[PDB]
Design a binder for this molecule. Structure first.
Ligand SMILES: CCN1CCN(Cc2ccc(NC(=O)c3ccc(C)c(Oc4ccnc5[nH]ccc45)c3)cc2C(F)(F)F)CC1
Length: 293
């Protein structure tokens, strides 16, 4: 499973942040870039063991990779993802990068691929339960996406979850839908509602959904809204999402192009309950017409 590491071989460089527990630092080990998560209190010891067990089973290109661990002190050593979070790319600090409809779709494809892996694990499936752009890392010039979990999430939370229902892996599907909307519009979902989280939960529980997107292709709108549905059983599985997104990528070439051009990005307030997309689908419609007569 894992490869044990001695803590003296870890050159700790800089602290990245603190999630639910522990602390994440950038570091170097045997002359490779690594991100480490180290324990801080004895209180956290069991939480690490759980996470260490989960990560030792997981091996997928679109999920963060576990190199090894030391047990004194207990510390997880990951392959360092360099490009920062998807949240940062979408909404982070000046200057923001330009990205295409192809990047958007490729990000969401890569996310469905990683979640479908987690949902398919044997003997028991892993559910993410906290899918959102701050938990989605980008690498290789912003072209490759890695799922992770640092441990408010209300804007991406399936209604059955925050209402204390016996939820399933379908909750991840709901989140994926919200993220799809988000990367396409480059807007924060339910940003106008605001206040505390329960105001968003109230809205979504009552059926509120992100506003519809102008000129959005019907095959994409159809997928997106199925994922949003109140009844979990009417949401597609991740495997179906992977399949559909894989087929759709045929009409979205260029996703291997690195993010490099800066972007002065105005957010024109979309009134009348319908917003404009950030990305441009003109090339999709053209490529689609060519194929369909
Ligand atoms: C029901 C609870 N769920 C159960 C299953 N859990 C899965 C689960 C659980 C734990 C994790 N662990 C981490 O991300 C995780 C663990 C350790 C570190 C250092 C970390 O941060 C990085 C790793 C690599 N490069 C980086 N660059 C900057 C920071 C960084 C992330 C990752 C997952 C994932 F979803 F990715 F598979 C998610 C929660």
């Amino acid at each position: 499973s894992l490869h044990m590491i001695d803590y003296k071989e870890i050159e700790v460089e800089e602290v990245v942040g603190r999630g639910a527990f522990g602390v994440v630092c950038k570091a170097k080990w045997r002359a490779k870039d690594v991100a480490i998560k180290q324990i801080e209190s004895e209180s956290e010891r069991k939480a690490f063991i759980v996470e260490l067990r989960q990560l030792s089973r997981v091996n997928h290109p679109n999920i963060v990779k576990l190199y090894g661990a030391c047990l004194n002190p207990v510390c997880l050593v990951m392959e360092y993802a360099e490009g920062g979070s998807l949240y940062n790319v979408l909404h982070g600090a000046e200057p923001l990068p330009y990205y295409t409809a192809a990047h958007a779709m490729s990000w969401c494809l890569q996310c469905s691929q990683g979640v479908a892996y987690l949902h398919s694990m044997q003997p028991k499936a892993l559910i993410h339960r906290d899918l959102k752009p701050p938990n989605l890392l980008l690498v290789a010039g912003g072209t490759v996406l890695k799922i992770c979990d640092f441990g408010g999430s209300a804007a991406w939370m399936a209604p059955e979850v925050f209402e204390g229902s016996n939820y399933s892996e379908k909750c991840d599907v709901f989140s994926w839908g919200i993220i799809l909307w988000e990367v396409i519009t480059r807007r924060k979902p339910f940003d106008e509602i605001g206040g505390p989280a329960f105001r968003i939960m109230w809205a979504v529980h009552n059926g509120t959904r992100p506003p519809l997107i102008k000129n959005l292709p019907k095959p994409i709108e159809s997928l997106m809204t199925r994922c949003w549905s109140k009844d979990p059983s009417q949401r597609p599985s991740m495997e179906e999402i992977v399949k559909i997104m894989t087929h759709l990528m045929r009409y979205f070439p260029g996703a291997d192009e690195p993010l490099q051009y800066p972007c002065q990005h105005s957010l024109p307030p979309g009134e009348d309950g319908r917003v404009e997309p950030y990305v441009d689908f003109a090339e999709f419609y053209r490529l689609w017409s060519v194929d369909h007569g």
